[PDB]
């Protein structure tokens, strides 16, 4: 671990001292020491790395994006400076990117991350990290290049494999992603044991018919990523009551269900009207959930925020729902019409979060053909009647009627969730 | 991308600060 150019060995005694103050928690004192050792040796890398590290720690205790922001500069400044050992160079700059990501300036992170591949082109671990920078801003095709290059040279990088498998699954290369996900998981390299790759491998094997897919859901549970082999959401609050099927009473939203079940024809009529006259507002499902068929959706609220244009189109419905913040405010849920046509089979899948239940309201239900399965039980809609399930559980749908099928979906906060918890949780 | 009915994005929440 090379951390002193020679000139930093010269002045080690003073450097040791400052860091002393910091490993004993006197982070204001420590920062100021390093500040004066840095004004006193403006070229000392370790002094500068000293200021930057205490600026980190201060920013953790102060829980302050600004303290942090100013340390990201100082980490940069260390690598701007001459005769910087390579260890301090990499660590300083890696620190910078991994923090920039924290604060969410990914554009920024990536540039530090590509600076870092230029500086060390023989580091597969740093390519790997850059590939991650690409995924976090959605740039899948560059992520795919990084990992293909890594794997060309270290073909067993456990970490490039789950990530490569992640990326091909995302492109619906379901057949090909499996061996990468599987191999990448068994590798045990550091980074493989994420529930994300567990979730996605078992899904891939399901969509190709592989019965082994539930041996891996038991596993991902038994490593502790999934609540259960049936319930594999990953954005959760540990605690919440977990059943696939609820009753209006069980949820304590008995009023919402009522304002829905008694005003169901209007809800329908407004969505039929949009179908007949504003069909553009209905949008194709774009999350790769369909084996086959047509399924479009007209969304009125998303992440607890209302869509004004959409609500010009079902306007009495948006007024009637504004009465209920348990759903209009679910920043982890949607409210939307969902029209599904014959020939349709929706792959088994899970939502992202346990933090929400999902109400369906029958609006136009054809008399045969429309199954939904959530775990062990199978159920059907009734017009003017509401169903409730925990979409964090595994659900699958078929539409094999002779005409279209329309329902209203209304997401509510998981009812055991307390007010401050609805204020805090990240929106999804 | 958002994760609305599924979990196909690499991160579904975009944290950005404390
Ligand atoms: C598309 C869908 C299957 C909705 C669904 O999966 C859900 O809300 O969890 C439907 O309209 O039937
Ligand atoms: Mn669903």
Distance CA A180, CA A188 (A): 13
Query: Which two tokens mark A252?
Result: 């304590």
Instruction: Please report the sign of the dihedral spanned by the C-alpha atoms of residue A312, residue A315, residue A320, residue A321.
Output: negative
Instruction: Give the DSSP H/E element, type plus range, for residue A298.
Output: strand A295-302
Contact with chain B for residue A391, Cβ under 8 A: yes
Nearest CA, atom 4, ligand 1? A338
Contacts of A277 (CB under 8 A, 6+ apart): none
Query: How many C-beta atoms surround the C-beta of residue A3 within 10 A?
Result: 13
- Method used experimentally: X-ray
Q: Which residue carries 């740039």 as its tokens?
A: A139
d(C-alpha B4, C-alpha A336), whole Å: 11
The number of the ligand 1 atom at minimal distance from the alpha carbon of A346 is: 3
Partner residue opposite A428 with nearest CB, options B8, B13, B16 = B13
Q: Which run of H or E residues covers position B11?
A: none
Q: How far is Cα A60 from Cα A400, in angstroms, rounded to an integer?
A: 56
Q: Of A165, A231, A172, which is closest to residue A201 (Cα–Cα)?
A: A165
Nearest to A160 by CA among A174, A173, A140, A144: A144
Helix axes A140-153, A158-170, angle to 10 degrees: 140
Q: For A232-284, give the DSSP string.
A: --SB--TT----SEE-HHHHT-HHHHHHHHTSHHHHHHHHHHHHHH-GGGSEE
Chain A residues 15-34 with a CB less than 8 Å from chain B: none
The pair of structure tokens assigned to A260 is 């829905």
CB A301 within 8 A of CB A310: no
Cα torsion A151, A158, A201, A145 to 10°: value is: -30
Buried b or exposed e, range A214-229, using 16+ CB within 10 angstroms? eebbebbbeeebbbeb
Q: How far apart are CA A348 and CA A289, in angstroms?
A: 8
From residue A278, give the alpha-carbon distance in Å to each of A9, A211, A282, A285, A335.
Answer: 73, 43, 8, 17, 18
Q: What residues sit around ligand 2, an ion, with C-beta below 5 angstroms?
A: B 5
Q: Which residue of A244, A334, A397 sits with most ligand 1 atoms within 8 Å of its CB, as the best mutation to test the pocket?
A: A397
SS3 A221: helix
Where are the domains positioned within chain A? 5-232, 233-428
Question: How many angstroms separate the CA atoms of A285 and A260, rounded?
Answer: 24
φ, ψ at A344 (rounded to 5°): -105, 135
Write the secondary structure of A73-127 as one string of H (helix), E (strand) and C (coil).
Answer: HHHHHHHHCCCCCHHHHHHHHHHHHHHHHHHCCHHHHHHHHHHHHHHCCCCHHHH
Ligand 1: residue whose CA is nearest its atom 9: A391
Terminal C-alpha separation, chain A: 41
Intra-chain end-to-end CA distance of chain B, in Å = 23
> How many Å apart are CA A123 and CA A120, to the nearest integer?
6
User: Which residues 6+ apart lie within 8 Å of A390 measured at CB?
Assistant: A231, A242, A243, A244, A245, A246, A354, A357, A358, A374
Token pair listed for A373 = 């399965």
- The structure was resolved to a resolution in Å of 2.3
Residue A284, strand partner residues: A296
Question: Helices A86-103 & A65-80, crossing angle to 10 degrees?
Answer: 150
Q: How long is chain B?
A: 18
What single DSSP character describes residue B6?
S
How open is the CA angle A351-A333-A338, to the nearest 5 degrees? 80
Cα–Cα distance measured from residue A119 to residue A117, given in angstroms and rounded to the nearest whole number: 5
Query: 3-state SS of A364-423?
Result: ECCCCCEEEEECCEEECCCECCEEEECCCECEEEEECCCCCEEEEEEEEECCCCCHHHHH
β-strand partners of A246: A388
Question: Is the Cα torsion angle A300, A305, A306, A308 positive or negative in sign?
Answer: negative
Contacts of A202 (CB under 8 A, 6+ apart): A213, A214, A216, A217, A220, A232
A411 in contact with ligand 1, CB cutoff 6 A: no
């Amino acid at each position: 671990p090379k951390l002193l150019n020679k000139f930093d060995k010269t002045i080690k005694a003073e450097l040791d001292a400052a860091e002393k103050l910091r490993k004993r928690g006197k982070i204001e004192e420590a920062v100021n020491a390093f500040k004066e050792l840095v004004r006193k040796y403006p070229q000392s890398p370790r002094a500068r790395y000293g200021k930057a590290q205490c600026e980190d720690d201060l920013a953790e205790k102060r829980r302050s994006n600004e303290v942090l922001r100013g340390a990201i500069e100082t980490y940069q400044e260390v690598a701007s400076l001459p005769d910087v050992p390579a260890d301090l160079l990499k660590l300083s700059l890696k620190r910078r990117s991994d923090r920039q990501q924290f604060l969410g300036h990914m554009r920024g992170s990536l540039l530090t991350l590509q600076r870092l591949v230029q500086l060390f082109p023989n580091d597969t671990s740093l390519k790997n990290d850059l590939g991650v920078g690409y995924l976090l801003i959605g740039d899948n095709d560059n992520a795919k290049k990084v990992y293909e290059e890594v794997l060309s040279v270290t073909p067993n990088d456990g970490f490039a494999k789950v990530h490569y498998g992640f990326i091909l699954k995302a492109q619906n290369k379901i057949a090909e992603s499996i061996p990468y996900l599987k191999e990448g998981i068994e590798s045990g390299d550091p980074g493989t044991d994420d529930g994300r790759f567990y979730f996605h491998l078992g899904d891939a094997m399901q969509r190709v018919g592989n019965k082994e897919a539930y041996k891996w859901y038991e596993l991902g549970h038994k490593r502790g990523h999934f609540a259960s082999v049936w319930q594999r959401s990953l954005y959760n609050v540990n605690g919440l009551k977990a059943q696939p099927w609820w009753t209006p009473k069980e949820t304590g939203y008995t009023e919402l269900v009522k304002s829905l079940e008694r005003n169901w024809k209007l809800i329908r009529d407004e969505g039929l009207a949009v179908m007949d006259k504003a069909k553009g507002l209905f949008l194709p499902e774009d999350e790769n959930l369909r084996e086959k068929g047509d399924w479009s959706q007209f969304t009125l609220w998303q992440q607890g925020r209302r869509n004004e244009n959409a609500c010009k189109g079902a306007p009495k419905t948006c007024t009637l729902l504004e009465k209920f913040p348990e759903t209009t405010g679910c920043r982890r849920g949607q409210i939307k019409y969902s029209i599904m046509h014959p020939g349709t089979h929706v792959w088994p899948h899970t939502g992202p979060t346990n933090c929400r239940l999902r109400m369906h309201l029958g609006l136009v239900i054809p008399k045969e053909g429309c199954k939904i399965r959530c775990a062990n039980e199978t159920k059907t809609w009734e017009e003017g009647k509401v169903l409730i399930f925990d979409d964090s559980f595994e659900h699958e749908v078929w539409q094999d009627a002779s005409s279209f099928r329309l329902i209203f979906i209304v997401d509510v906060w998981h009812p055991e969730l307390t007010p401050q918890q609805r204020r805090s949780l990240p929106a999804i | 991308g958002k994760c609305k009915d599924g979990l196909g994005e690499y991160t579904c929440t975009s944290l950005e600060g404390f």
